[PDB]
Amino acid sequence: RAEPPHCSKTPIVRAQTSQNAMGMQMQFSIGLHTAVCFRLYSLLHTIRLEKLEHHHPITQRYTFGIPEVHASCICECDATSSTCTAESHQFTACPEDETSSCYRTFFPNQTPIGCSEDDIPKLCCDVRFKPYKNMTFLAVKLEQPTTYATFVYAAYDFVNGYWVEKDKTKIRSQLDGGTQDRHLDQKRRISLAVTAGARASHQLETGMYFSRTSNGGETEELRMQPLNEITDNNFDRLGWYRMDDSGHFHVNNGVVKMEEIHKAKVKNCKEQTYKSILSANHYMPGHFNLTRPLEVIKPWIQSARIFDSSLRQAVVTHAEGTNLQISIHLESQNLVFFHNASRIRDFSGSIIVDSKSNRLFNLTVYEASGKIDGSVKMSTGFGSDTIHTFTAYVSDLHASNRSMIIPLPAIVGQGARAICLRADSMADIDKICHVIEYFESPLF
Amino acid sequence: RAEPPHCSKTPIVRAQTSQNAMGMQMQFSIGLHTAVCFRLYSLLHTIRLEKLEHHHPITQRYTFGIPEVHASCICECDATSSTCTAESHQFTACPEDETSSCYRTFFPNQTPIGCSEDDIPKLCCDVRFKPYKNMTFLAVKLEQPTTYATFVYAAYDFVNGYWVEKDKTKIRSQLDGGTQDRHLDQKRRISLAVTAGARASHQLETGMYFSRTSNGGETEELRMQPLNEITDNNFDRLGWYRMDDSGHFHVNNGVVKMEEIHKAKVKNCKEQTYKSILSANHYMPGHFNLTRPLEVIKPWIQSARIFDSSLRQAVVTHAEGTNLQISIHLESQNLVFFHNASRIRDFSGSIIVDSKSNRLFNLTVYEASGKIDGSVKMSTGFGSDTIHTFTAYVSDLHASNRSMIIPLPAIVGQGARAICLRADSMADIDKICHVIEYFESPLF
Amino acid sequence: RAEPPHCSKTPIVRAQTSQNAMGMQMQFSIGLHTAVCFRLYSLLHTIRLEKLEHHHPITQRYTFGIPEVHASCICECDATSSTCTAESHQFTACPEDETSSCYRTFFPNQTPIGCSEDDIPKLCCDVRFKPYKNMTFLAVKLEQPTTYATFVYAAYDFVNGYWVEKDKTKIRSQLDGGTQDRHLDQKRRISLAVTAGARASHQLETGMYFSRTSNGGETEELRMQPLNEITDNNFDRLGWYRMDDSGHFHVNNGVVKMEEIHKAKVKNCKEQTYKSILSANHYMPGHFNLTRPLEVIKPWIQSARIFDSSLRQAVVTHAEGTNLQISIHLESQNLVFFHNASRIRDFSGSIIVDSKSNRLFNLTVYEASGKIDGSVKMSTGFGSDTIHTFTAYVSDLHASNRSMIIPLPAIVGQGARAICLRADSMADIDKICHVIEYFESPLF
Ligand SMILES: *[C@@H]1O[C@H](CO)[C@@H](O[C@@H]2O[C@H](CO)[C@@H](O[C@@H]3O[C@H](CO)[C@@H](O)[C@H](O)[C@@H]3O)[C@H](O)[C@H]2NC(C)=O)[C@H](O)[C@H]1NC(C)=O
Ligand SMILES: *[C@@H]1O[C@H](CO)[C@@H](O[C@@H]2O[C@H](CO)[C@@H](O[C@@H]3O[C@H](CO)[C@@H](O)[C@H](O)[C@@H]3O)[C@H](O)[C@H]2NC(C)=O)[C@H](O)[C@H]1NC(C)=O
Ligand SMILES: *[C@@H]1O[C@H](CO)[C@@H](O[C@@H]2O[C@H](CO)[C@@H](O[C@@H]3O[C@H](CO)[C@@H](O)[C@H](O)[C@@H]3O)[C@H](O)[C@H]2NC(C)=O)[C@H](O)[C@H]1NC(C)=O
Ligand SMILES: *[C@@H]1O[C@H](CO)[C@@H](O)[C@H](O)[C@H]1NC(C)=O
Ligand SMILES: *[C@@H]1O[C@H](CO)[C@@H](O)[C@H](O)[C@H]1NC(C)=O
Ligand SMILES: *[C@@H]1O[C@H](CO)[C@@H](O)[C@H](O)[C@H]1NC(C)=O
Numbered sequence A, B, C: 001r002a003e004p005p006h007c008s009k010t011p012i013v014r015a016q017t018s019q020n021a022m023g024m025q026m027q028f029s030i031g032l033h034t035a036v037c038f039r040l041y042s043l044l045h046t047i048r049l050e051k052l053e054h055h056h057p058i059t060q061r062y063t064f065g066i067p068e069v070h071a072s073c074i075c076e077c078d079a080t081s082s083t084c085t086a087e088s089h090q091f092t093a094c095p096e097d098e099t100s101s102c103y104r105t106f107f108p109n110q111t112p113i114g115c116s117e118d119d120i121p122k123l124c125c126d127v128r129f130k131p132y133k134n135m136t137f138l139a140v141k142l143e144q145p146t147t148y149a150t151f152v153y154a155a156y157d158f159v160n161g162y163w164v165e166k167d168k169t170k171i172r173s174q175l176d177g178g179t180q181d182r183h184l185d186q187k188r189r190i191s192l193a194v195t196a197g198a199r200a201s202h203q204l205e206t207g208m209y210f211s212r213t214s215n216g217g218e219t220e221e222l223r224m225q226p227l228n229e230i231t232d233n234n235f236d237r238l239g240w241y242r243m244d245d246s247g248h249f250h251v252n253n254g255v256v257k258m259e260e261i262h263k264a265k266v267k268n269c270k271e272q273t274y275k276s277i278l279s280a281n282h283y284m285p286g287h288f289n290l291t292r293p294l295e296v297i298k299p300w301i302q303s304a305r306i307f308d309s310s311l312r313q314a315v316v317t318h319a320e321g322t323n324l325q326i327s328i329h330l331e332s333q334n335l336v337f338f339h340n341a342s343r344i345r346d347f348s349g350s351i352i353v354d355s356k357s358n359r360l361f362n363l364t365v366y367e368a369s370g371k372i373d374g375s376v377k378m379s380t381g382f383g384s385d386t387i388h389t390f391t392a393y394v395s396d397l398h399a400s401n402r403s404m405i406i407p408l409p410a411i412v413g414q415g416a417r418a419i420c421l422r423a424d425s426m427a428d429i430d431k432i433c434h435v436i437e438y439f440e441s442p443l444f
């Protein structure tokens, strides 16, 4: 059951520690989602880089909805009539649905269609807003993150004909600063010093993100769509329809802004017919479309969520990330690193350009384990020139079936082509080649 | 007095230089704010990574203020009266306080409150703007930076029972490109080659920043608050009230924009009472709040200033940054690296979540020096599981009292918990544990 | 003709591969635009890091123009006249130049200049838009990139008194993830494993970019200027004048927005004289200025283009970038690395602060090759303190004349100063010093 992970083929650098006036270190690079194994001269010590996370501080929060809008207008032929005035309809709310918010607009200087030729009619409206399908979202401002690696340390013994887990701990290490060090084992003999070369290869930009909220205010996967900061009131972007301290929704500064967004005009004054539109985005009917979550659209994002109910940090878990630098240090004793052979029976897949322009090789490896080297060819011919080389990693100790996404450079354009896969150290004779089809989704 | 810094425990890699058809290098990683020491086989050579700076080019500048606003309105009952017209009050400045700027607005189609029932009154206003407390700020657009490390090289001799500084130079090295090399010592025997793994762990985003300015235009610590670029005229953001080539302030395109931002309505025409507001942000009274400087709110920022009076570059000094890669190269001779022991008597502190959502351990170490390894526990019990491990560095050669900020991952939530500190290489018996209290400031 | 590149002086680290239960690697850092050479113990194997590219996915596209604008207005003295009404001129297009787009505006409540004192005139306009000089541009939204290094591998034999190229291949390697490996030579004996320390030192921010388009929709060098996203309709930014599925240009939501951007007022009603302006940016006459391409203004950008006619990815080629980490691995045999001597006859140049605040040393080296170490001095005196040290690389095997841009830190302010250059390993006696002039272009 509990077994060592695939032990990765790793070059080891022996570094000598500086002298104390009154010591060898084993240095190596470790890949995200991979493990490195060693014995101390007996337990098999394994270190797996399990996670790469950005912890973004949340500097603003507000709750918003998507309004369902209806405008009800009345026309008056006589400009001097007590019905329809700037008093009652210019910069004022409708007089007192409990969930509705209602703002008034005034349109004098209308054309006398349905009136006398000497009349200058006036149109007066109530612009009603209700939350569409009672949807609620939390808007958050995310700022520059702190970075953390999660390592899983596990020591194994092979007794009674099976591997047995002798010790297991999760280790957390901040990556933005200098070398971070601590004891690895329960006996405190081995230490793990973690050094990042620099900032994680990917990062979510500073700005506005959002999550759908439940009745209890429970959040989910973060989404990105043009969204107002707390101090912004741009009607082309999300967040102009906000919930107050009570669960009541309002058009942000609606009393004053209504005359800027509500566009209306008389068709026939007597018939009480008129033209009316909202000059804004993100409302119902017909002006709202919800983006899919960040994790669905970004191959590099495994997850992007708000950490807990205190709503202080958002955590982005990376599916892709550069290697970390490790230094293993310690009676007189020697460390020996071990790796497992890599293997592959077959593969299948396709070359994809998705609706967001991600150019990927969607790959499934069969009965595979460890380091798999791949070559993308110029055409369908297995002997045609190589235009791209990559390496995929399968962390399972035993031959497993696994699906993965391999980013592809732009040179890998339209059309079917050959892709050849080969397990690390295997001869060219043991490569697997297949003609792989191309599928391009239009930009949506 | 002038003494070597704490010599950091450093793993050294011996690299062999490629052959010239017609040479050993000492390689190591160096942490920001730390020093590495060596002897050449006698002077004690010390290299300290003193600074990490981003030099951002300034691509736009303009001077702005915070206006103090007052609207003075007059009402006229008779729509055809020569008093209050589109001629005199629509898209025009007030006729000619020397520092004031005055823009006019026109509101016809008013309700006859205080007039006859057949009247259609008109309201006319003067909207006056003055600089609040004569405050001046420089808006700057900062673009992608160039990166520089500052090293302090200092060679020491121990004669007459004391250390004496034999040589000292400041060394500057660009980090964005390839390996940068130069001679270290006065005798030109030792060379320092600096290689960054990649871009500095933190960076100030491209965009608009600002500084308060004095009478002489002297700048200070940079601040970040939504602010218009030179070509933008968004009234929800700072910078719409700009100073011209003379020290005169104007509402940017005020003559044309006034009718969009000034919202007014008659209360009683005869009584000369009316409602009036400005639909904009960042003005007085009651619509202005100044953000604290970037250095105060961002733990990673030690300083963010405009370099000099030419106003061409902004310099961001980093409080946190990844390690740099060093190669020391050179008659036949050998380099020996030395380190000092690490020590700690005690510590105090608290776990803090500030008003900007920075999750930190505010730490004070007592009589400490060198490398200090810390463990954050699951609960108040000193033997409860470790949820986070970190390392702090104290660069003082002698036991010193120092305060520092340690970023914490989100798993370190609410509540008091134990934190244990231990100097590098000390036995578990020499660790110091304390129950540390939690304090969370609400989001402001 | 076809000759090896300059073989760079490189420190080599020998790493030992982990053991397989059933192997030495040669590790080194390689600089962008440089080459490393070795022999296997005979062919001279050369690896050149030729390119660093970001492949940005394009998530939005739209075609836009720069409108040439003309407003034609008519005044009517009598407010009740059938000529000039809200019906015909408020929120409507002009009635049906084939390329023109025409939107109407209505301005009642005018002052009776040229009318009777009891008249309340009305102004009616046609606001016409045509594409200025038939210019077309493609707006693109660029998102976070994938990173690729291009290596040129070339093996040389020296027979018949000349170098002869025995093999040459271009190698592509993704940098965002883990170690990428493949065979280097035709015989598959040597392998090249590429590891990036982290994300490329520079990156183009997520956002809106544009390119001029030809008749066939052919793109060119990308430019950056405030530009609307597809869902934005901000008149202070580019892209509000868009081309539809036919080659026809429209003011985005022009029918509704016209009353917000067209500002007009009667001068004399009878004379048919009036004031008229567009409250917007990026139109002709007098309100349009085109930024120079990204590659021209950013020293770090060699090129920034749309890859091909499918318009799915934009490719940014970097002129500056950090080193990559290489591991060369393989019968029992040994790898020996070789380098060429560095040389320089003379140099010329100037210190420049351009119109975009880039602080650079514009340098020309004469009869130079390899590694050139430079020192920037405090004053004009050749013996004055060094305020900055840098290293430039010339990849040509033979002494060549080459121009380059060296970024300078802000400490290198105004005024003439000495700069001293010296080829790697040359004695201080062989340095070349010149007093170098300062030229600062004002901020434009
Ligand atoms: C992956 O690599 C590790 C080495 O890094 C392999 O570990 C080896 O596991 C075998 C058992 O599978 C151990 O062999 C011996 O087993 C007999 C009982 O059959 C026992 O009497 C011996 O004392 C011994 O334990 C061997 O010690 C162990 N090697 C090391 C260096 O730890 C592992 O088998 C590899 N896994 C796969 C799936 O290839
Ligand atoms: C930090 O580490 C350095 C070594 O890296 C220590 O330097 C050592 O300093 C002592 C003096 O404190 C030197 O010892 C000797 O002093 C006597 C006079 O008392 C003199 O006659 C001898 O010739 C000799 O200089 C010693 O040479 C020096 N060691 C090295 C390798 O440089 C330093 O003491 C440490 N500092 C602290 C505060 O622990
Ligand atoms: C740059 O460095 C390389 C070494 O890394 C130099 O390569 C050397 O090239 C010479 C020829 O220029 C080779 O020498 C010999 O030439 C004679 C014929 O004149 C021939 O009979 C010998 O068998 C031999 O090839 C030498 O082997 C080669 N060295 C290596 C190690 O490859 C190159 O000359 C340098 N270039 C410059 C411009 O300095
Ligand atoms: C949910 O929507 C319904 C109408 O569909 C409404 O009656 C109800 O009050 C809304 N829920 C809340 C919590 O307001
Ligand atoms: C990749 O292919 C698998 C089938 O092997 C499919 O289930 C999966 O959804 C595909 N993923 C993408 C991103 O195309
Ligand atoms: C400063 O403010 C005062 C009023 O408080 C004003 O009289 C003075 O002119 C202002 N200073 C300048 C330099 O304009």
Ligand SMILES: *[C@@H]1O[C@H](CO)[C@@H](O)[C@H](O)[C@H]1NC(C)=O
Pocket (backbone or CB within 6 Å): B352, B362, B363, B364, B403, B405
């Ligand atoms: C940290 O604690 C010290 C007292 O030891 C205090 O002076 C300092 O202001 C605190 N800093 C922060 C950021 O909380």
Ligand SMILES: *[C@@H]1O[C@H](CO)[C@@H](O)[C@H](O)[C@H]1NC(C)=O
Pocket (backbone or CB within 6 Å): C099, C133, C134
């Ligand atoms: C180009 O501009 C001319 C006027 O200068 C116009 O006649 C022509 O129709 C425009 N070209 C296209 C393709 O519309």
Ligand SMILES: *[C@@H]1O[C@H](CO)[C@@H](O)[C@H](O)[C@H]1NC(C)=O
Pocket (backbone or CB within 6 Å): C352, C362, C363, C364, C403, C405
């Ligand atoms: C640098 O100087 C050369 C002349 O040696 C000139 O042709 C080139 O345009 C200059 N480049 C810059 C960016 O100033």
